[PDB]
Amino acid sequence: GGKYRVYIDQYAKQDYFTVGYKGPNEMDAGIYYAPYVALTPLRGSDPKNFQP
Amino acid sequence: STTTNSNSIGRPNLVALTRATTKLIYSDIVATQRTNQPVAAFYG
Amino acid sequence: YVIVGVVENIGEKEIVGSIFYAPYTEGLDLDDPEHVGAFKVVVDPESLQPSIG
Amino acid sequence: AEIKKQMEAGALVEIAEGMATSIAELQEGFNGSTDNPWNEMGFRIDKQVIEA
Amino acid sequence: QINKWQTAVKSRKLKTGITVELAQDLEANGFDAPNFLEDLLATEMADEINKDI
Amino acid sequence: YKVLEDTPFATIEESDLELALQIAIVLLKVRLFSDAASTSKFESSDSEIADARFQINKWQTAVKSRKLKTGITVELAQDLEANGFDAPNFLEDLLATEMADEINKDI
Amino acid sequence: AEIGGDHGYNATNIAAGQTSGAVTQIGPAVMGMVRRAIPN
Amino acid sequence: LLVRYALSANPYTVAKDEKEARIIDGGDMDKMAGRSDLSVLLGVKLPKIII
């Protein structure tokens, strides 16, 4: 309706909808996802056999 | 009545860091020069 | 205890004292070589965390 | 079907959780620990053949 | 007469090992984590050198 | 510690084991064993390397308060001026001084 | 080896910056705050 | 006038109760008192002044 952003729960188990609010200010969230470290790669190899 | 009993604090100020380590003095105790070989041999 | 002793340096070679320490750094490629000694980092192949000595 | 009914009922519900740091940090025998390998994955590459 | 006093250089070796999570917490808490580790080992070693001397 | 002379402590009458040891060091019966390792110790392919360790603990306290009050009757304040004093500054100095003194006492 | 360790997920200990590991924290600091909205 | 301050004990000052802890109350003189290596006290026994 030009009002609600609709997203598909591609893995929904039964059949349902959830209506939610989110403001322009992230503090007005309801629920937060607050990353600290994102995908740090770690690399090495086993010196015994040198496989990475 | 709003007092400091209501105020909730984010974090304390860490103010100062102290590392308790030995003052290391050997420089004024042992005469020394670098060795550039696996074995040193001084002449008497 | 109380101990006394000598540290003298009369130039070039005339270095005198008890216990010469005399560190050996030759052969190491050192940053700030006055440091005396070298660091190595490995990083485990099981855990992937660092290990430094 | 029974599980979905319990989910609808709110008796047993969908969840996902991050790992405790105290466990994740010492995986793969760190600091004398044991029986704690990382979860892992890769790929196959299989083949299919036809004829005229 | 000229006599000589000789000895091989001997070694000292230290390791710490700081997890990546610990290094990250140290940075978050205001510590220079990569230099912190090196200072820990360098300081501990230098102290052990003084004990030995 | 390392033994330099056999049956160390045979000749040390000191009963406090810690001091008997200090005596053994002075008398060269025993020497501090602290020393660098022969290089073979750490190239063996199985090498126990002493661990360096650390710990960071914290100390914390709340900020607390001190408070002083004087108050000067208007007529008394007027009298301070009449008597040769700077009345509003006399008062700030009085309170400031009393507080500074109490801080010094506390410390 | 030294570790970060973790919290017991006990908000008391969290607020205090306590860990089972090597380094005690200053504190969570601030992720912002929410002030209740005023009605119209 | 109002004055405020913490007047706390320095790190490594520890009460012989907790003995080892991650967080130490830097105040709490009731436990912290007498246990610090950054200051050492010796009292002095003197004859009295005649008044």
Q: Does E42 touch chain C (CB under 8 A)?
A: yes
Does any CB of chain G come closer than 8 Å to the CB of residue D20?
yes
d(CA G19, CA G3) in angstroms, rounded, equals 10
Token pair for residue F16? 């406090």
User: Sign of torsion, CA B9 B11 B14 B15?
Assistant: negative
Q: Pairing mode, if any, of strands H23-25 and F58-60?
A: parallel
Q: Is the dihedral of CA A18, A23, A26, A28 positive or negative?
A: negative
Determine whether the interchain pair B30/C19 forms a contact, defined as Cβ–Cβ distance below 8 Å: yes
Quickly count: other Cβ atoms within 10 Å of residue G1's Cβ.
19
Given a contact cutoff of 8 angstroms between Cβ atoms, the answer to whether C23 and C36 are in contact is yes
How close D31 gets to chain G, by Cα (Å)?
Answer: 6
Q: Are G27 and D50 in contact (CB under 8 A)?
A: no
Chain G (1-40) residues lying within 8 Å, Cβ to Cβ, of chain H = 16-19, 24
* Interchain contact C49–D (C-beta under 8 A): yes
Contact yes or no for G22/F55 (Cβ under 8 A): yes
Chain A residues whose CB is inside 8 A of the C50 CB are none
Q: Could you tell me if E33 lies within 8 Å of chain C, comparing CB atoms?
A: no
Contact F37/E8, CB-based, under 8 Å? no
Task: Tell me if chain C has a CB within 8 Å of the CB of D28.
Answer: yes
C-alpha–C-alpha distance, residues C47 and D24, integer Å: 10
Whole-angstrom Cα distance, residue B31 to residue E10?
18
Cα C9 from Cα D21, distance rounded (Å): 56
Backbone angles phi, psi at C41, to 5 degrees: -120, 135
**Burial classification of residue C23, based on how many CB atoms lie within 10 Å of its CB (0-12 exposed, 13-18 middle, 19 or more buried):** middle
G34 within 8 A of A28, measured Cβ to Cβ: yes
DSSP3 helix / strand / coil % (chain E, rounded to 5):
55, 15, 30
Rounded-to-integer distance, Cα D20 and Cα G7, Å: 9
Chains that touch B (3 or more CB pairs under 8 A): C, E, G, H
A48 with C46: CB under 8 angstroms?
Answer: no
Judge contact between G34 and A27, C-beta under 8 A: yes
Quick one: resolution in A?
A: 3.4
Q: Within a 10 A sphere around the Cβ of F71, how many other Cβ atoms?
A: 6
- Tell me the C-alpha distance between A42 and D38, whole Å: 13
- CA atoms in the 13 A half-sphere facing the CB of G18: 14
For residues D37 and D27, the answer to whether their CB atoms sit within 8 Å is yes
C-alpha H37: how far from chain center: 10
Q: Can you tell me the distance from the alpha carbon of B36 to that of H31, in angstroms, rounded to the nearest whole number?
A: 56
Q: Write the DSSP string, C2-52.
A: -----EEE-STT-EEES-----B-TT---SSGGG-S---B---SSS----B
Alpha carbon D22 to its chain's center: 18
**Chains contacting D with at least 3 CB pairs below 8 Å?**
A, C, E, G
Find all residues with CB under 8 Å of G24, minimum gap 6, and list them.
Answer: F56, F57, F58, G17, G18, H22, H23
- Give dist(CA E8, CA E17) in Å, integer: 30
State chain B's maximal CA–CA distance in angstroms.
86
3-state secondary structure of E14: strand
Helix/strand/coil for A5 = coil
Torsion region of H38: left, alpha or beta (phi above 0 gives left; psi -120 to 50 gives alpha): alpha
Tell me the residues of chain A between 11 and 40 that have a Cβ less than 8 Å away from chain E. Answer: 36-37, 40
d(CA C52, CA E36): 12
Token pair recorded at residue H2: 């109002």
CA of residue E15 relative to chain centroid, distance: 8
Amino acid at F80: L
Asked whether F54 and G2 are in contact (CB, 8 A), the reply is yes
Gap from G37 CA to chain E (nearest CA, Å)? 33
Which tokens sit at F67?
């408070």
Question: CB-CB: which of B22, B38, B42 is closest to E47?
Answer: B22
Strand partners, C52: C41
The values of phi and psi at residue D13, to 5°, are -125, 160
Residues linked to residue H5 through DSSP beta bridges, in sequence order: F64
Q: Under 8 Å CB-to-CB from E29, ≥6 apart: which residues?
A: F56, G23, G25, G26
By CA distance, what is G30's nearest residue in B? B10
H helices present in F3-86, as ranges: 17-26, 74-82
Residues 13-32 of A with CB under 8 A from D: 13-14
- Consecutive H or E run containing G38: none
Q: How far apart are CA H25 and CA G16, in angstroms?
A: 11
Q: To which H or E segment does residue F100 belong?
A: helix F87-106
Q: Which residues contact B32 (CB under 8 A, 6 or more apart)?
A: C15, C17, C20, C21, C22, C23
Token duo for residue H35: 């246990």
d(CA D45, CA A20): 42
Query: Which run of H or of E encompasses E26?
Result: helix E20-28
The rounded distance, in Å, linking the Cα atoms of D19 and D24 is: 6
CB C49 within 8 A of CB E19: yes
Residues from chain A that touch G31, judged by Cβ atoms under 8 A, are 34
Q: Do chains B and C touch (3 or more CB pairs under 8 A)?
A: yes
Burial of E2 (0-12, 13-18, 19+ CB in 10 A): exposed
- Do the chains contact at G21 and E25, CB–CB below 8 Å? yes
> CA–CA distance from D26 to each of D20, F56, G4, G25, H6 (Å)?
11, 20, 10, 20, 39
Residue pair F37/E10 in contact (Cβ under 8 Å)? The answer is yes
- The 10 Å CB-count burial string (b at 16+, else e) for F91-107 is beeeeeeebeeeeeeee
Choose among A42, A36, H37: nearest CA to C43.
Answer: A42
Is the separation of the CB atoms in H30 and H15 below 8 Å? no
Interchain contact H/G (3 or more Cβ pairs less than 8 Å)? yes
Regarding chains D and A, contact by 3 or more CB pairs under 8 A is answered as yes
Q: How many Å apart are CA C20 and CA C1, to the nearest integer?
A: 21
What are the tokens at F91?
């008062």
Rg over CA atoms, chain F: 35
Measured in degrees and rounded to the nearest 5, phi and psi for residue G7 equal -90, 165
Per DSSP (E only), the strands in F30-104 are 30-31, 50-51, 58-60, 64-67
Distance (Å, rounded) from C-alpha E44 to C-alpha F54? 10
Residue with tokens 């914390």: F60
G39 touches A at CB < 8 Å: no
Q: Are A46 and D28 in contact (CB under 8 A)?
A: no
Q: Are H50 and H44 in contact (CB under 8 A)?
A: no
| Eight-class DSSP state of F42 | G
Q: Which of D21, D25, D30 to mutate to test the interface with G (most CBs of G within 10 A)?
A: D21
Separation between Cα atoms, residue G19 and residue G8, nearest integer Å:
8
CA A40 to each of CA A33, B44, C48, D22, D36: distance values in angstroms, whole numbers, following the listed order: 18, 59, 11, 18, 20
Work out the minimum CA distance from C46 to partner chain A, whole angstroms: 8
Distance CA B11, CA G30 (A): 8
Mutate to test the interface with B, among C21, C25, C30, C34 (most CBs of B within 10 A): C21
Test A42 with E20 for CB contact under 8 angstroms: yes
Q: Are H36 and H13 in contact (CB under 8 A)?
A: yes
**Quick count: other Cβ atoms within 10 Å of Cβ E25?**
25
Helix (H) or strand (E) holding F3: strand F2-3
DSSP label of G2: B
**Coil vs helix vs strand at F37:** strand
Contact C49 A47 (CB under 8 A): no
CA distance H27 to H29: 5
State the amino acid at position A16 in one-letter form: Y
